[PDB]
């Protein structure tokens, strides 16, 4: 399961 | 009584049999079986199916629901089909059909000729490869005809048949664009930052444009049977990177006319990358011979 791939985030902008 | 408004995907749990693990999902399992009389014609058919942790949070499985839901209308040759539910009890099970040899990114990395489970058989050749971009693509362009952008295209996400087709598979993060054309995210989320467009990280932005970028890294991982794009580099330093105009190398000896397609995905401007449809097109020509036989391209649905 590549947990890595993903990242917890919001748009920059 | 309830019985008189049945749900046309429920499928009996007494004609599913369970075989063998295919992998783990984040937050469930996929297992293996074979399911007796699901499709007309067919007395057994195997299949793959998705189950759901007893811990899957609501997320997980608000999550879970999008993804069998959006599938429920979907039928292309190039897209992973959904076979039934089978709801009545627990756990849940949701059937697909099965792509024997897996996930692009497992399939790519047992070619490798020092994998520890290589099969037998040289890498994807030249060809090999334009036939796999070219039914990504397909599937692709037919999910965008239906006006859905997927934002979550990748090596991983790409199931393999026992033919060898490539279909597009995994539909949770897909969103429905058909009034906009267009999916901006809200709030915070877990995203794919290593296959993002430059513009749904700084905007947060959603297109079949995007969509189109993360193609190109899709290119890539297969010119370099499923590395880690931007190896080295933490994910806060991909989005940075990207937002600035970065992009990928071509991998050792990329083939020139795959390096060609990446260069036109990677277009900082969503609205200069092209489209699936014009994706299939460059590479109609170099296709086995059931290619228009199946394609969404050559249907008369592609309208
Ligand atoms: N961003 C993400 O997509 C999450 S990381 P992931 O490794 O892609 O996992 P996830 O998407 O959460 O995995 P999933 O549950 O979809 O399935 C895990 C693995 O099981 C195999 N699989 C899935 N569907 C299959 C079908 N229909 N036929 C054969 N094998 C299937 C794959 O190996 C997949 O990676
Ligand atoms: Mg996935
Ligand atoms: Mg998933």
């Keep these: ?12 902008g | 009584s309830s019985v008189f408004v049945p749900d046309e995907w429920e499928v009996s749990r007494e004609k599913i049999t369970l075989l063998r693990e295919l992998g783990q999902g984040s937050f469930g399992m996929v297992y293996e079986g074979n399911a007796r009389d699901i499709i007309k014609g067919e007395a057994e058919t195997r299949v793959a199916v998705k189950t759901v942790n007893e811990s899957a949070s609501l997320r997980e499985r608000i999550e879970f629901l999008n993804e069998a839901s959006v599938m429920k209308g979907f039928t292309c040759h190039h897209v992973v089909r959904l ?3 089978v709801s009545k009890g627990q756990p849940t099970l949701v059937v697909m059909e099965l792509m024997a040899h897996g996930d692009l990114k497992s399939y790519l990395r047992s070619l490798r000729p020092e994998a520890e489970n290589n099969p037998g058989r040289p890498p994807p050749t030249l ?5 796999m971009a070219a039914e990504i693509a397909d599937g692709m362009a037919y999910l965008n005809a239906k006006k859905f952008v997927h934002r ?6 790409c199931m393999v ?29 877990l995203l794919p930052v290593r296959w993002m467009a430059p513009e749904s990280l700084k ?9 189109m970028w993360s193609f190109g890294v899709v290119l890539w991982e297969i010119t370099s049977l499923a590395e880690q794009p ?15 105009g970065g992009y990928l190398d071509q991998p050792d000896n990329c083939p020139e006319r795959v390096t060609d397609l990446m260069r036109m995905c ?21 296709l086995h011979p059931s290619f228009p036989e199946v394609s969404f391209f050559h249907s008369e649905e592609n309208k």
């Design chain 1, 1 to 12: 399961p590549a947990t890595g791939d993903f990242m917890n985030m919001s748009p920059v």
């Design chain 2, 83 to 85: 076979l039934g539910v």
């Design chain 2, 127 to 131: 060809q090999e490869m334009i036939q």
């Design chain 2, 152 to 157: 979550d295209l990748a090596a991983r996400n």
């Design chain 2, 161 to 189: 048949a026992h033919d060898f087709t490539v279909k597009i598979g995994d539909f949770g993060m897909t969103r429905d664009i058909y009034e906009t054309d267009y999916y901006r995210k809200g709030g915070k989320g």
């Design chain 2, 203 to 211: 905007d947060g932005v959603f297109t079949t444009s995007s969509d």
């Design chain 2, 230 to 244: 931007y190896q080295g580099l933490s994910n806060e330093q991909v989005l940075k990177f990207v937002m600035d």
């Design chain 2, 266 to 286: 990677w277009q900082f401007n969503p609205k200069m990358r092209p489209t699936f449809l014009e994706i299939v097109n460059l590479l109609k020509d170099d």
